[PDB]
Write a protein that binds this ligand. Structure first.
Ligand SMILES: *[C@@](O)(C(=O)NCc1ccccc1)[C@H](C[C@@H]1CCNC1=O)NC(=O)[C@H](CC1CC1)n1cccc(NC(=O)OC(C)(C)C)c1=O
Ligand SMILES: *[C@@](O)(C(=O)NCc1ccccc1)[C@H](C[C@@H]1CCNC1=O)NC(=O)[C@H](CC1CC1)n1cccc(NC(=O)OC(C)(C)C)c1=O
Ligand SMILES: *[C@@](O)(C(=O)NCc1ccccc1)[C@H](C[C@@H]1CCNC1=O)NC(=O)[C@H](CC1CC1)n1cccc(NC(=O)OC(C)(C)C)c1=O
Ligand SMILES: *[C@@](O)(C(=O)NCc1ccccc1)[C@H](C[C@@H]1CCNC1=O)NC(=O)[C@H](CC1CC1)n1cccc(NC(=O)OC(C)(C)C)c1=O
Lengths: 220, 216, 220, 220
């Protein structure tokens, strides 16, 4: 793979959003990945509606503000034949009935690809596909208060991921030989969290925080 | 009262502590306030045991990691006749049976003083007494994510406080005046663990509505 | 020696100060070290006057806002027979004539000790003496913007130190690169810089930024 | 966490070994932790070579029979790409030139985790990771002479440790008793010392003998 990747510089990534007090991180991970793949297919970046997923993707297994899975969101988009734009179907941070309108659909997918559960495979997918939906163990005070640098949490689990986010690149700090490597990760807690709403997550430390345990992207 | 106050400069304030995953903010606010009044009385700054309060002040109304009140903690120290040092009774972030040892008491109090619920009264207290225990509305993600600057949260309620902290001073922009507030979330939170809260903005986050300190 | 030391927890360290736009970092390093040794002796923590050093220790070789050395400041306090409190002789961030007044002296020393130029000797001094004055290379953008974590600058020189600061302890934390040890360093750029005015400088990494190359403390 | 943990009952722990008159306690603590993480990852318990560490991990900071650190041993395994089995590279109790052969490597790691200096942190790590390397203050004749019971030494330091051992569990005096909890600790002085070569060290008594002051384990 390339030594570093940052899909923001290629036009694939919308600004950081804020999910508010609703357990919809999975929907923000899913729209981020679908935004990237739609741009890859069309050359146009269009922010997509998390609310559409929160309200409408129950039949695929999602539970609105009580949690969900990015793969279930990609399955909804496939089953439904579409997903509305963020502009047409804005985010309210609470679960309501479905108001999908196919006239405002700006995305589609044909299913999804689950990446093999190791970081070399994840790197190859980030480098060759675009931004990748992942699940991480974010269940630590240290994650809430993250400011800068490469996030490494000694109590992180590679099995108990609880938070959906989006890998938009990877790279290294310091001298390359120091192996000070990170994943560049877009969160959905607004730009006041973290580094402008981003976190650099420990990379190539045997799947730290489970970042490679449940990674996928939609097929467009 | 002076235009600005910072009790850290006069030796009244211990380093920032970390309560961890236990709902014991009330105990850190209490030890903070008692640490300051004990220094005011004796000239000695000794870090005091939050674990002692978590484990032992049930009879006064406190519920350990499930919450509590600074005044109930001050009441416990009075009833108990003392309070152990932090070093003698260190913090475990979980509730256990009481292990108080009078031989390791380093602090006492004779009750407590609740301050009238106005920011002018709070300012006089800070200026003349020392660090003051206060309750604030901290239930907003903006407070979780705070790092620098003067904190102001549109959605902050002046009547639904949920978090005990310690006012160690106040200052001005030059009016975006502020209270200098020690938290108990470790040094990585906020400005080395401190937050500047909006001062004189309609009792922002209820900072003056439940202010108090122990009588030493 | 211990694996972790923090003299702030033992009462040896005043709050972070702000030297402003005057090249007086050496004076703040010196007062911090003497504040610690005076506390060790008397049990009383008294903030000391940097302005007294800036205005008055020229005869020992210091040059006010144009630079100085902690050892010259310790020599001044010895030669002069005292040093005024911060409250009696407050900081103006500009060089003026000497206004030292012995009636307001609150500190003394009988010289200083220069520590051998090895991080292991710095460690034993920090462990057994208290806060130690040191000189570091702080001339890098990364140092200005430091917010948290262990500071490591690949371009840092161990021979061109330009900045006096104060080691108040040392410790460890898990990191991506497994360079986990740090010196806990008090700066003089106010509380808004770094972590409450502190930085965790890389420890046991080939004398990173020269932190063990010009270490000393006053003899009280 | 569970109220009691004993990783020996899960297959994570090799029999007690005897370091002899060589200052290699750090190498035994390290192989013990790596034996546990290799079992966690592969389901196979294979005894590992302390001799390989004694002879070969000088480049990482270790000094053979003159002392060393578990973290440096874990770094060696990462740098070296492997570690030989006990059987392939048996223990000689004296420093020799390195005889590592990659054909007999049975263990690997990608660095290590230093646990924060709290007994509650150590408790969580033991409950969720497996056996943990620790440093303790063993510099008392009471430790030399230990045979049975819960070890408590009034002169024990919580800051200055001198001996590397392996926490394999923890336990209690009785279900509803805060008193006489213990860490279950594997030593490397053979099975005639202590309790079949194990010691129950006072737990939750102000981090007794420093057991939580320098705890770590390899990343696998
Ligand atoms: C997501 O992390 C999120 O929206 N975070 C911000 C937030 C947290 C809590 C409340 C409001 C906002 C989301 C949070 C969940 C749903 C509600 N409470 C939570 O903890 N996480 C998930 O939806 C997460 C996504 C998958 C990729 C990892 N998720 C989905 C489905 C099930 C679970 N967990 C689960 O079943 O856990 C057990 C322990 C089995 C109950 C899950 O975390
Ligand atoms: C305190 O704010 C705290 O420890 N914060 C960090 C923290 C929060 C949650 C979990 C772990 C750590 C503390 C937080 C409480 C206890 C656990 N959950 C909470 O929300 N706040 C209090 O203990 C607080 C203190 C008073 C001075 C302001 N407090 C005391 C007693 C009762 C309540 N709340 C309450 O009764 O709320 C309702 C919902 C009305 C029952 C309270 O906040
Ligand atoms: C100190 O770092 C400081 O006050 N920094 C903040 C600051 C910088 C510039 C202007 C205002 C505030 C201090 C900075 C010096 C003096 C003014 N310009 C500087 O760069 N550093 C020292 O005084 C430093 C202390 C020793 C322990 C390291 N110091 C002392 C004496 C000489 C030099 N440098 C020097 O002669 O450099 C050459 C290249 C030869 C001119 C020095 O850095
Ligand atoms: C280990 O404890 C051991 O092998 N003990 C049995 C033994 C003792 C003496 C001689 C032969 C066998 C080991 C003992 C050391 C090496 C030889 N002399 C000793 O006392 N301890 C260490 O290697 C220990 C490991 C760390 C986790 C605690 N260790 C490592 C590095 C440095 C030191 N000490 C040190 O620097 O001490 C001072 C006095 C501060 C210089 C250390 O003990």
């Amino acid at each position: 793979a390339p030594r570093s990747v940052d899909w923001r510089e290629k036009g694939y990534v919308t600004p950081v959003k804020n999910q508010g007090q609703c357990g919809s991180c999975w929907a923000f991970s899913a729209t981020g990945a679908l935004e990237g793949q739609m741009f890859r297919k069309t050359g146009r970046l269009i922010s997509l509606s998390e609310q559409n997923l929160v309200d409408c993707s129950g039949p695929q297994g999602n539970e609105g503000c009580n949690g969900g899975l990015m793969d279930y969101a990609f399955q909804y988009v496939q089953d439904n034949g579409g997903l509305d734009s963020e502009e047409s179907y804005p985010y309210e941070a609470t679960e309501e009935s479905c108001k999908y309108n196919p006239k405002y659909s700006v995305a589609n997918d044909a299913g999804f690809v689950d990446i093999p559960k190791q970081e070399k495979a994840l790197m190859k997918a980030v480098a060759t596909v675009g931004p990748i939906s992942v699940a991480i163990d974010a269940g630590h005070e240290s994650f809430l208060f993250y400011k800068e640098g490469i996030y490494f949490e000694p109590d992180c689990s590679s099995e108990d991921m609880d938070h959906g986010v989006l890998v938009v690149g990877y790279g290294f700090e310091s001298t390359e030989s120091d192996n000070n490597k990170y994943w560049l990760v877009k969160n959905s807690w607004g730009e006041e969290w973290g580094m402008g709403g981003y976190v650099k997550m420990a990379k190539d430390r045997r799947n730290h925080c489970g970042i490679a345990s449940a990674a996928s992207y939609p097929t467009v």
